[PDB]
Ligand SMILES: *[C@@H]1O[C@H](CO[C@@H]2O[C@@H](C)[C@@H](O)[C@@H](O)[C@@H]2O)[C@@H](O[C@@H]2O[C@H](CO)[C@@H](O)[C@H](O)[C@H]2NC(C)=O)[C@H](O)[C@H]1NC(C)=O
């Protein structure tokens with residue numbers, strides 16, 4: 144299935160509209176999700192792992208089909224130990240600086 | 241559970257698998273015939289109407305007649321803070337009461353405020369990933385762990401396995417930490433990946449919530 148995402152960089156991104164690919168009903172972890180977010184940061188804007196560590200702030204927000212959201216800090220190295228159904232993700236907003 | 245071993249069949253009859261369409265996503269603990277206890281982050285972002293509570297399981301890849309399956313009728317939280325991962329506990333009321341037998345039993349809880357000192361020997365368990373790579377376990381896994389107070393928080397119970405890469409992993413959230421026969425922890429979060437060998441795993445501290453738990457389950 145297709146999951147829309149946005150990327151904002153220094154507040155001044157938000158021009159581009161495209162999607163991520165997930166497997167229907169597959170349980171994934173936040174480390175899985177981190178790798179997908181870091182992959183599109185690199186392919187869409189060339190923002191590398193080194194760039195993320197050098198940034199002032201780097202977060203992404205997962206918006207869920209039950210109306211809730213979860214904000215993940217890409218610099219914290221903290222991961223809840225749960226699995227999430229990929230079909231429950233509505234969209235992802237990524238924000239660097 | 242990375243670096244654990246298979247549990248003997250139904251050794252931990254309070255152990256619960258929370259499942260959605262794609263299977264197990266979190267553990268939980270039976271604390272009364274009609275209540276289970278898990279992490280709040282396990283259901284914050286899911287449709288609770290879709291959660292199946294599987295009791296009496298051992299091997300999740302097999303059809304097991306010993307299983308009892310319930311829906312979640314009501315949930316109870318107590319000041320969960322998802323940003324700071326504080327008070328990461330949820331009680332789930334089932335649409336009925338489990339039948340207590342050899343395979344389904346209610347766990348015992350500690351006294352309110354009991355704090356485990358550094359070095360206490362405990363057992364973690366769950367159906368989470370068997371390694372940083374690889375998938376969820378089929379057979380319930382268990383792991384000897386030690387309570388630690390360095391690199392922890394006072395608002396958590398933290399555990400480490402000395403000199404080994406072992407610990408909880410994804411799908412183990414919500415699962416109990418058993419110390420001296422009592423449920424002292426609910427698996428909450430890891431740091432720097434599963435089984436880093438450096439950063440202790442963090443559990444919600446059950447003893448800090450016993451008065452609240454008791455008010456709900458009576
Ligand atoms: C209590 O609920 C269970 C579970 O219900 C199923 O799972 C829920 C999450 C939700 O998806 C429900 O709509 C599902 O039906 C009931 O178990 C089901 O019972 C029916 C009828 O007995 C049976 O056909 C299904 O196979 C059962 N499903 C499972 C997963 O075991 C149970 O009946 C409910 N208890 C009472 C007293 O109604």
Ligand SMILES: *[C@@H]1O[C@H](CO[C@@H]2O[C@@H](C)[C@@H](O)[C@@H](O)[C@@H]2O)[C@@H](O[C@@H]2O[C@H](CO)[C@@H](O)[C@H](O)[C@H]2NC(C)=O)[C@H](O)[C@H]1NC(C)=O
Pocket residue numbers: 361362363384418419420421422
């Ligand atoms: C690994 O753990 C098992 C399980 O007991 C755990 O540890 C206790 C201190 C307490 O936290 C329990 O609630 C846990 O479930 C240990 O098994 C025990 O071993 C002793 C000595 O052999 C024996 O007298 C007990 O009866 C055993 N209990 C059970 C439930 O089997 C085991 O010794 C631990 N192994 C290591 C190497 O530490």
